[PDB]
Amino acid sequence: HHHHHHMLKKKQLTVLDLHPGAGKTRRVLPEIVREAIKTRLRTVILAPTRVVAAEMEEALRGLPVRYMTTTEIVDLMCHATFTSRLLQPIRVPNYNLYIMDEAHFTDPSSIAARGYISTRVEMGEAAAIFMTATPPGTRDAFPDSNSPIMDTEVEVPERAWSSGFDWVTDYSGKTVWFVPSVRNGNEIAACLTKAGKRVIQLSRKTFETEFQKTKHQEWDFVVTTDISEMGANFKADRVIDSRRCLKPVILDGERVILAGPMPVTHASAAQRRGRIGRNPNKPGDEYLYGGGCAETDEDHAHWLEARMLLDNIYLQDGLIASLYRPEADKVAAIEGEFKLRTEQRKTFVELMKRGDLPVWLAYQVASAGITYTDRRWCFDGTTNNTIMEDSVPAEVWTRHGEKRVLKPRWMDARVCSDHAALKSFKEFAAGKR
Ligand SMILES: Nc1ncnc2c1ncn2[C@@H]1O[C@H](COP(=O)(O)OP(=O)(O)O)[C@@H](O)[C@H]1O
Numbered sequence: 001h002h003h004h005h006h007m008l009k010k011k012q013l014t015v016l017d018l019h020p021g022a023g024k025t026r027r028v029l030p031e032i033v034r035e036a037i038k039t040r041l042r043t044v045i046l047a048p049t050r051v052v053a054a055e056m057e058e059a060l061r062g063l064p065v066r067y068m069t070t071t072e073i074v075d076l077m078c079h080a081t082f083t084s085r086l087l088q089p090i091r092v093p094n095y096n097l098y099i100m101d102e103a104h105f106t107d108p109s110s111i112a113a114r115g116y117i118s119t120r121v122e123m124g125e126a127a128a129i130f131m132t133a134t135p136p137g138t139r140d141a142f143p144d145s146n147s148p149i150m151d152t153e154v155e156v157p158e159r160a161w162s163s164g165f166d167w168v169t170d171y172s173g174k175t176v177w178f179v180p181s182v183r184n185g186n187e188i189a190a191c192l193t194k195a196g197k198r199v200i201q202l203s204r205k206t207f208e209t210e211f212q213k214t215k216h217q218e219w220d221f222v223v224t225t226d227i228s229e230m231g232a233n234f235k236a237d238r239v240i241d242s243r244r245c246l247k248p249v250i251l252d253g254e255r256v257i258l259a260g261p262m263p264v265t266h267a268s269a270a271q272r273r274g275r276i277g278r279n280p281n282k283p284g285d286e287y288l289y290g291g292g293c294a295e296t297d298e299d300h301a302h303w304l305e306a307r308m309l310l311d312n313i314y315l316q317d318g319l320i321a322s323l324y325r326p327e328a329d330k331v332a333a334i335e336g337e338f339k340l341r342t343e344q345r346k347t348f349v350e351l352m353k354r355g356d357l358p359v360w361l362a363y364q365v366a367s368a369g370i371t372y373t374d375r376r377w378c379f380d381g382t383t384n385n386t387i388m389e390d391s392v393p394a395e396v397w398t399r400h401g402e403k404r405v406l407k408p409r410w411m412d413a414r415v416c417s418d419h420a421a422l423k424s425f426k427e428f429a430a431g432k433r
């Protein structure tokens with residue numbers, strides 16, 4: 001009940017960079033929405049995840065918002081839903097105001113959304129507010145917090161241990177642990193469970209369902225990938241941060257491998273640490289971090305994947321949206337080089353949305369003129385593209401009634417990097433998803 005005016009203006013992009021936990025999502029977003037409704041500004045609110053969309057729903061109770069997730073001149077949807085609708089024939093309104101929460105998110109749909117939105121603003125067609133404690137390029141891993149944090153550099157294990165890490169388990173509070181990969185998290189979770197700890201595991205595939213268990217069940221550790229690192233409210237006392245992640249890298253323009261683990265950005269480290277120190281009544285939450293940060297993330301496939309999406313979004317005849325200016329030097333590409341014709345673009349969209357294929361892999365298949373249900377390409381690659389299950393070639397019973405080795409024409413290590421990913425890709429290859 002302490003509303004502040006936002007004298008909003010078209011032709012302007014505002015970066016709202018209040019520190020983690022300052023109340024961007026819970027306090028400032030509702031103020032902006034009130035001003036938007038009053039002034040009849042057609043507005044979209046963009047959430048990075050269904051979890052943040054749920055936290056926005058709570059904060060926006062009483063305000064007329066159309067939720068396009070799970071009279072009303074404000075719409076709310078996920079970053080990925082916005083970008084997917086921009087690729088499709090579907091009528092996406094020409095919003096007067098774009099509000100992007102967690103505007104640092106580096107998933108390709110989020111990078112593409114920022115490029116589209118910043119281009120609309122540069123063209124003088126709209127206003128935008130990018131809400132993030134860690135705008136692109138930030139070199140500050142230790143921003144302000146609601147409560148003092150104890151920051152300690154330690155050796156953080158990335159494997160099961162039988163000695164040398166007593167501080168991990170001799171701790172009676174709640175810990176969020178950022179691991180380099182789903183498989184490393186599996187191994188750490190099993191070590192913690194053997195030591196008598198109650199562990200919840202989060203990844204992109206499982207976040208939207210498993211996060212609810214953090215609100216509803218008792219737990220000692222959340223073992224999570226980077227999906228959890230922003231806009232997640234955990235009731236935690238300690239973060240353990242590997243400060244490292246596997247990175248998908250395009251090798252020789254022909255395949256995607258998972259490289260590293262490699263250091264995270266200062267933005268990622270700040271958001272991970274920012275999960276604690278959020279309660280002003282609870283000083284001395286701990287952030288225990290396992291190494292340094294780096295801004296050398298140009299090898300990450302997500303920058304080129306963002307160009308693949310942007311090249312396929314219509315703005316105006318002959319105009320392709322640029323990446324948001326501070327991100328524009330992340331990728332060597334020719335503007336438009338990934339533009340697909342109408343039917344190939346529909347296949348591209350369906351492979352990402354219904355197929356759950358990575359952007360790069362969906363683009364290879366769609367650009368080859370393959371239709372969505374034609375899975376021959378899953379079996380006709382070179383022998384070095386053979387996918388392995390328990391150190392033996394993975395086998396699929398195909399729609400054509402043959403037992404065939406999984407051997408895709410284009411290899412993207414993201415489809416087979418963990419048991420759940422491979423299970424899903426095997427079903428996809430069988431025409432059974
Ligand atoms: N369910 C809740 N009830 C009360 N306080 C909450 C709840 N969820 C989050 N908070 C607190 O509200 C504050 C603002 O959080 P939030 O708006 O999510 O911050 P930001 O978006 O700037 O990171 C933080 O101190 C956070 O701990």
Ligand SMILES: [Mg+2]
Nearest residue numbers: 024025101231
């Ligand atoms: Mg927030």
